[PDB]
Design an enzyme around this catalytic site. Structure first.
Site, PDB file in Angstrom:
ATOM      1  N   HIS A  32      -3.041   3.779  -9.048  1.00  0.00           N
ATOM      2  CA  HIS A  32      -3.921   2.746  -8.523  1.00  0.00           C
ATOM      3  C   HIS A  32      -3.992   2.756  -7.001  1.00  0.00           C
ATOM      4  O   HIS A  32      -4.386   1.753  -6.400  1.00  0.00           O
ATOM      5  CB  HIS A  32      -3.480   1.373  -9.028  1.00  0.00           C
ATOM      6  CG  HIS A  32      -3.887   1.096 -10.440  1.00  0.00           C
ATOM      7  ND1 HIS A  32      -4.670   1.961 -11.171  1.00  0.00           N
ATOM      8  CD2 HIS A  32      -3.618   0.053 -11.257  1.00  0.00           C
ATOM      9  CE1 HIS A  32      -4.868   1.463 -12.377  1.00  0.00           C
ATOM     10  NE2 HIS A  32      -4.240   0.305 -12.456  1.00  0.00           N
TER      11      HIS A  32
ATOM     12  N   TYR B  44       0.973  -0.418  -5.757  1.00  0.00           N
ATOM     13  CA  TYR B  44       0.393   0.063  -4.514  1.00  0.00           C
ATOM     14  C   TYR B  44       1.303  -0.170  -3.318  1.00  0.00           C
ATOM     15  O   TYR B  44       0.888   0.064  -2.179  1.00  0.00           O
ATOM     16  CB  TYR B  44      -0.963  -0.597  -4.286  1.00  0.00           C
ATOM     17  CG  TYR B  44      -1.096  -1.933  -4.967  1.00  0.00           C
ATOM     18  CD1 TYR B  44      -1.908  -2.083  -6.077  1.00  0.00           C
ATOM     19  CD2 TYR B  44      -0.434  -3.052  -4.482  1.00  0.00           C
ATOM     20  CE1 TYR B  44      -2.032  -3.297  -6.705  1.00  0.00           C
ATOM     21  CE2 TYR B  44      -0.561  -4.276  -5.099  1.00  0.00           C
ATOM     22  CZ  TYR B  44      -1.364  -4.394  -6.209  1.00  0.00           C
ATOM     23  OH  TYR B  44      -1.496  -5.611  -6.833  1.00  0.00           O
ATOM     24  N   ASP B  45       2.523  -0.635  -3.550  1.00  0.00           N
ATOM     25  CA  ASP B  45       3.518  -0.780  -2.504  1.00  0.00           C
ATOM     26  C   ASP B  45       4.293   0.521  -2.327  1.00  0.00           C
ATOM     27  O   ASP B  45       4.167   1.465  -3.110  1.00  0.00           O
ATOM     28  CB  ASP B  45       4.469  -1.927  -2.834  1.00  0.00           C
ATOM     29  CG  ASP B  45       4.883  -1.936  -4.289  1.00  0.00           C
ATOM     30  OD1 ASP B  45       4.155  -2.529  -5.110  1.00  0.00           O
ATOM     31  OD2 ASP B  45       5.935  -1.348  -4.612  1.00  0.00           O
TER      32      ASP B  45
END
Lengths: 629, 116, 625
Positions: free
Chosen positions: C146, C109-110
């Site tokens: 995600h 999720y970065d």
């Protein structure tokens, strides 16, 4: 493909079966009454469309075409060689990301390929319409290719230069590893691939294959020329105004070479066909001159000169061409008078400067511009590209349209004095690839003045001693430029004792008039050769025939050298011994003197006729046709 | 003799070979060649008759001919292929009947002249 | 390395070349960039929920308990204060990008992959939310299955808590569907996963539902400090995974994950140019893979062979091959060594022996002899085996009258109909061949477009000038036929014909792309102009060269084109530009022959070329000169 847009700016309905929107747009453009019918947004959109079409040279439809003016005008500092202005632009702070794209192109054109690559990478960073992004990717791949090729050439080639640090080379190799230029367009947003389809060709390995294959129309022997020229101008304007680095690649240079060469050859062919049929076309301008200078090698210009009659090609915009040449000379001075040499820039710029100064022969230059060009050519042109002989050839070409003024004579005199100063060292020797040396500059000066005495060389000669031999045998070849006192001072350093000294004196110009003692020396050598019978013989015969010798006691030695017997007494010569190749060793003066003898003229005419019929030799044919020997 | 070229404007042969020669004074020179420059428009004096000027280079530096240059080729070697080509050199020299039949390179100064 | 490891490398690199490689990047790659791991977040959640500090299910349950108790606001605050950091991109990110993946699916999720893509210069449509699937701006996706924190550092934007994983299929139907479609349609390499990850096992569970062989086994780059146990390897490879273990490849420290990842990534990158050729059987297999598609074509231009081998070699028109850009093994040199030495032929395998025999026949019939350094006295007589070239009009008519025994007979018949002026029948036959046909299909498409262009130009001439020229308005084509062919060819685009082709055709038949335009004449045109300039400069100075003529290339290339366009039955033989090329080549050859005559002789082929491609004015110009 709904319409053809022709290179003259005329639109033609091609493949649309619907409304004629181009015709309707042109109808709206011609008359303002229907323009008010559009809405305000439609009105401003039409204004933008009209500005675009008039800026891109689209005027009307072919059926409504009138007096069509098609003048090439490239809005590019890079095309015009405005290197100082380009440097100033790069120095400034770029307000926009479009100014950065221009800056990166200008850096590429100035040889600063590392800075250009960094700027293109920065633009790619800050650019995600996305049209500059795609163009920046194209140009960064192009500059990476340029850097790789330059590194390869520098490894192959006269001093080892390392313009790109190995850390930068490794960094760009890692950054551009497994980089696919083909995948670039397809990876763009689907809206870009629709709006900017026309840009996809910039990702191809080749993009001028069509334009090159349409060059076969210039080789037909049965307008195509105008179409080819306007297409070339279109390509140049697109590649330069849009700041695309592929304009520097070998494909584009070869395309420009082929198109211009075939255009000039075609014009020459039409001229000769007309002369054959009518019994008594290509008009070059500033842009054609710049294209030939930038894209042609010297060998290509030489092929153009031998193939066609460039002297029969009149040159226009000569003030613009003179400004271009003066800018080239100024950049040569900046690059080499100072320590501003950029090796990457030098490699690309020196060929263009050489070609420009070579093609300047056909351009009338003002006295000040001629002075600038001549000074830069003589003094600040590097010797690795233009040696003493090549630089003399370039300088002497400039006298075709500009008979040597006093200022240019002074510049050549300054060059001669500098060369004499370089001869203080005993180790210094002039290196010439053409066989032309510092003596030729003085010969040219005396040809264009016939009375010029160079005071500084006379001062150097009067200061001469016996120790510095190099200066004496240098200034002996420059004898006509010296004064009477300098001539007398110089003549004391050489002796004419034996015949070899006499031959040396004639060859270096020490003595131009044959004294009776020289004749006696010649007779002594001839008697020695005759006695020992059971190279200079032909020279002595030619001198006797040329009235350089009036001793009249040479007929004793007739019967040893065939050329000597031919020259001493043409009337009594047996011409079965004549060798036609002899005529290929004589120059204009000797051949003309042989032609006007009223003796041996018919024998050599028959020999030349036999040589032309049997061998179809161009040298023999031109010898027979020019002097009618 | 695959890079051998016959230049007919001045009837010579351009061949990438070196000459080891001896003059009439027993002086010896090694790895020397000649370069011919065809200059029909050269600004001649009163005593110049040749249409070409020839420069002799030994060990990469040219020679100043102060003595008589009557010479005989002792050994001619092709640089590209080190095979001895002396016999061909004498054959061509006898056939050509012109000064210095084989020359390293011929420079044509006609097409670059303003009077061309 | 190990044989199966080398096979995995070959598959990955082949997929990367084909643009069908997709990288599934896990938390391990982000962790090497020091991005905060999720166990710290669970530690903080336990610190707030309980006194002080797990199982695999706990990593999701503890954040779920923190949510349910303390509030979405508190969960948001902890996520914001933990994940709002800036971290550099790994060299592994750049290596993955340098592999040129079609897509990058990731559970991270970065924005580290986003930052790497932006830095390297790759444009990816970043799909991290449901609405991003329909709004994707390109066909290449950076699919964050995600979620991420682009909208904000909120817990609703990402899949972290236990409830997020239970309701993932319900909350991310488009993203999950897109991920599974990418897995099904691409070659997947897993990097940054521990072989026991929740996502890996969910994907292996979905893979179980698929058909037995309907999918390709994804690759798994395992970078654990210890080499994989054999039983674990069998278990996971029977589940549909192909594991490349970093620990087995190289030895390194337990905590030195960077080198473990870099070993596999650099071994994949450096293998992009590697062809994996050591034995003569591998040489024969590679050359056969390059050449066998060309067995469909009757003749191949030798200048076209540089595109077949991707500029590894120059294939000169005299039949000599030269190293050009082949930095690896010399397979052409090895092939010629096998050709000259009969004993080493027997060393080849049974299949490789017949493959080498086919290669030998192809190269011998195409006039490819040896390398430049082994070149002897090369003399190749020109023979064009075509009835159309020789003007065998009666023979072509009889051959057309015959019944076709194949689609190649139909292709030849259509070409012969084109050459006999029966363009309507030729167009219909080309359409029929297109129906029943992918070399022949593409060539029939090209030839049918060319014959449609010929019909259009002929109709224009007949309507505009045919009535005046013939004294009578000729109507060879009925208006019905003209309207029908216009309807069929109104939307046809010759430029995109090659692009709209199966990728195997666009790779096996890259040289056939040039036939769509006049690009196939470009190299020969450029060479002809160059050699014309060179030859004319030589004649101008009066120099004569003893040895091979400078125009032989101009001759050879000439007969490389006529043989290619006539034996392969391409309508380009009628092209005005091709006729100009032939005319210029023959004119240069005749001019050079005349120059050397007073110091080449005209044969049947030269006579036919002059008759076919010269106008009377061209012949008159030659007679004058």
């Amino acid at each position: 493909y709904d319409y053809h847009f022709e290179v003259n700016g005329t639109v033609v309905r091609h493949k649309n079966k619907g409304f004629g929107y181009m015709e309707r747009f042109f109808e709206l453009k011609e008359s303002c009454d229907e323009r008010s019918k559009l809405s305000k947004k439609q009105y401003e959109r039409f204004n933008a469309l009209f500005n675009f079409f008039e800026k891109n040279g689209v005027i009307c439809m072919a059926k409504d075409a009138g007096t069509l003016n098609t003048s090439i005008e490239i809005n590019s500092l890079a095309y015009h060689g405005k290197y100082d202005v380009m440097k100033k632009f790069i120095e400034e702070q770029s307000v926009s990301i479009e100014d950065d794209y221009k800056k990166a192109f200008f850096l590429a054109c100035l040889g600063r390929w590392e800075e250009s690559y960094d700027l293109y990478s920065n633009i790619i960073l800050n650019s995600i319409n996305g049209c500059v992004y795609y163009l920046s990717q194209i140009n960064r791949y192009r500059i990476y290719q340029s850097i790789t090729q330059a590194v390869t050439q520098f490894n192959g080639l006269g001093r080892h230069y390392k313009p790109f640090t190995d850390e930068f080379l490794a960094r760009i190799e890692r950054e551009m590893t497994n980089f696919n230029i083909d995948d670039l367009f397809n990876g763009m947003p689907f809206e870009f691939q629709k709006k900017y389809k026309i840009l996809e060709f910039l990702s191809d390995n080749q993009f001028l294959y069509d334009d090159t294959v349409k060059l076969f129309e210039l080789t037909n022997k049965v307008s195509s020329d105008i179409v080819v020229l306007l297409r070339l101008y279109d390509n140049l304007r697109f590649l330069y105004e849009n700041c695309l680095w592929s304009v520097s690649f070998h494909e584009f240079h070869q395309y420009i070479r082929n198109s211009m060469s075939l255009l000039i050859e075609k014009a020459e062919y039409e001229r000769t066909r007309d002369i054959d049929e009518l019994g008594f076309g290509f008009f070059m301008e500033y842009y054609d001159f710049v294209n030939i200078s930038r894209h042609f090698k010297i060998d290509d210009i030489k092929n153009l000169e031998r193939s066609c009659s460039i002297d029969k090609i009149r040159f226009g915009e000569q003030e613009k061409i003179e400004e271009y040449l003066v800018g080239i000379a100024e950049e040569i001075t900046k690059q080499f008078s100072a320590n501003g040499m950029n090796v990457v820039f030098y490699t690309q710029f020196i060929s263009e400067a050489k070609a420009a100064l070579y093609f300047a022969k056909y351009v009338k230059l003002s006295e000040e511009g001629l002075g600038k060009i001549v000074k830069a050519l003589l003094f600040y042109f590097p010797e690795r590209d233009l040696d003493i002989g090549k630089r003399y050839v370039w300088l002497e070409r400039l006298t075709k349209c500009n008979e040597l003024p006093k200022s240019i004579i002074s510049i050549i005199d300054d060059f001669l004095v500098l060369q004499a100063e370089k001869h203080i060292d005993q180790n210094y020797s002039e290196v010439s690839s053409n066989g032309l040396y510092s003596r030729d500059y003085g010969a040219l000066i005396k040809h264009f003045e016939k009375n010029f005495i160079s005071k500084r060389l006379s001062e150097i000669t009067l200061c001469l001693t016996q120790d510095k031999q190099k200066q004496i045998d240098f200034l002996f070849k420059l004898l006509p430029l010296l004064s009477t006192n300098a001539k007398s001072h110089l003549l004391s350093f050489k002796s004419v004792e034996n015949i070899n000294d006499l031959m040396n004196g004639i060859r270096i110009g020490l003595i131009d008039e044959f004294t009776p003692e020289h004749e006696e020396l010649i007779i002594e050598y001839l008697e020695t050769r005759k006695v020992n019978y059971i190279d200079y013989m032909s020279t002595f015969g030619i001198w006797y025939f040329l009235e350089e010798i009036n001793n009249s006691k040479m007929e004793e030695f007739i019967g040893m050298d065939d050329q000597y017997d031919f020259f001493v007494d043409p009337e009594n010569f047996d011409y079965k011994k004549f060798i036609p190749s002899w005529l290929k060793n004589y120059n204009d003066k000797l051949l003309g003197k042989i032609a006007g003898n009223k003796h041996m003229k018919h024998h050599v005419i028959e020999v030349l006729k036999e040589r032309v019929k049997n061998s179809n030799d161009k040298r023999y044919l031109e010898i027979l046709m020019n002097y009618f020997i | 003799t695959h890079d051998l070229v016959y230049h007919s404007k001045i009837n010579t042969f351009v061949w990438d070979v070196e000459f080891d020669i001896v003059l009439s004074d027993s002086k010896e020179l090694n790895k020397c060649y000649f370069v011919k420059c065809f200059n029909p428009y050269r600004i001649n004096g009163k005593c110049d008759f040749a249409v070409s000027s020839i420069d002799i280079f030994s060990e990469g530096k040219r020679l100043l001919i102060e003595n008589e240059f009557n010479f005989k080729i002792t050994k001619a070697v092709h640089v590209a292929t080190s095979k001895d080509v002396t016999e061909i050199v004498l054959h061509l020299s006898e056939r050509i009947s012109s000064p210095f039949p084989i020359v390293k390179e011929v420079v044509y100064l006609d097409w670059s002249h303003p009077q061309f | 390395l190990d044989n199966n490891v080398v096979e995995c490398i070959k598959e990955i690199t082949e997929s990367s070349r084909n643009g069908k490689l997709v990288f599934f990047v896990g938390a391990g790659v982000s962790t090497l960039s020091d991005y905060p791991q999720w166990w710290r977040l669970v530690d903080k959640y336990h610190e707030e929920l309980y006194g002080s500090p797990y199982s695999s299910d706990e990593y999701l349950r503890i954040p779920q308990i923190f949510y349910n108790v303390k509030g979405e606001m508190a969960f948001d605050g902890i996520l914001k204060d933990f994940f709002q950091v800036d971290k550099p991109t790994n060299p592994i990110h750049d290596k993955i990008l340098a592999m040129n993946p079609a897509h990058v699916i990731t559970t991270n999720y970065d924005n580290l992959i986003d930052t790497a893509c932006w830095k390297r210069g790759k444009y990816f449509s970043v799909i991290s939310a449901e609405e991003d699937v329909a709004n994707a701006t390109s066909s290449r996706y950076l699919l964050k299955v995600h979620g991420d924190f682009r909208k904000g550092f909120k817990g609703e934007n990402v899949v972290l808590k236990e409830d997020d994983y239970l309701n993932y299929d319900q909350n991310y139907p488009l993203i999950s569907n897109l991920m599974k479609t990418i897995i099904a349609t691409h070659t997947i390499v897993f990097i940054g996963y521990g072989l026991g990850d929740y996502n890996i096992n969910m994907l292996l569970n979905w893979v179980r539902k698929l058909q037995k062989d309907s999918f390709h086994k994804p690759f798994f780059i395992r970078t654990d400090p210890s080499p994989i146990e054999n039983e674990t390897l069998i278990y996971y490879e029977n589940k549909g995974l192909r594991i490349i273990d970093a620990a087995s490849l190289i030895d390194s420290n337990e905590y030195d994950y960077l080198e473990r990842y870099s070993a596999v990534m650099d071994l994949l990158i450096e293998s992009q140019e590697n062809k994996f050729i050591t034995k003569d059987d591998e040489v024969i297999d590679y050359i056969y893979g390059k050449i066998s598609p060309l067995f469909a074509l009757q003749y191949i231009r030798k200048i076209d062979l540089k595109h077949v081998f991707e500029y590894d070699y120059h294939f000169e028109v005299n039949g000599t091959v030269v190293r050009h850009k082949n930095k690896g093994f010399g397979y052409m040199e090895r092939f010629f060594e096998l050709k000259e030495s009969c004993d080493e032929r027997s060393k080849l395998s049974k299949k490789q022996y017949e493959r080498f025999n086919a290669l030998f026949n192809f190269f011998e019939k195409n006039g490819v002899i040896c390398m430049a350094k082994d070149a002897g006295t090369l003399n190749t007589s020109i023979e064009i085996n075509s009835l159309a070239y020789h003007g065998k009009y009666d023979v072509m008519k009889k051959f057309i009258e015959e019944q076709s025994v194949s689609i190649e007979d139909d292709y030849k018949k259509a070409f012969f109909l084109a050459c006999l002026g029966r363009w309507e029948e030729s167009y219909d036959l080309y359409s029929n061949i297109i129906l029943n046909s992918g070399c022949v299909y593409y060539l029939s498409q090209i030839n049918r477009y060319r014959i449609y262009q010929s019909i259009t130009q002929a109709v224009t001439q007949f309507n505009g000038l045919g009535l005046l020229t013939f004294g009578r308005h000729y109507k060879p084509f009925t208006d019905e036929f003209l309207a029908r062919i216009e309807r069929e060819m109104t939307n046809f685009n010759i430029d995109d014909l090659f692009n709209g082709m199966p990728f195997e055709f666009q790779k096996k038949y890259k040289i056939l792309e040039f036939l769509s335009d006049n690009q196939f004449l470009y190299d020969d045109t450029v060479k002809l102009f160059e050699l014309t300039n060179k030859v004319r400069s030589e004649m101008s100075e009066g120099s004569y060269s003893f040895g091979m003529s400078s125009d032989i290339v101009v001759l050879l290339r000439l007969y490389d084109n006529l043989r290619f366009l006539y034996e392969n039955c391409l309508w380009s033989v009628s092209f005005h530009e091709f006729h100009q090329y032939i005319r210029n080549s023959m004119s240069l050859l005749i001019e050079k022959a005349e120059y050397e005559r007073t110091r080449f002789f005209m044969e049947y082929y030269d006579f036919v070329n002059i008759s076919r491609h010269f106008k009377i004015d061209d012949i008159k110009n030659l007679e004058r000169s």
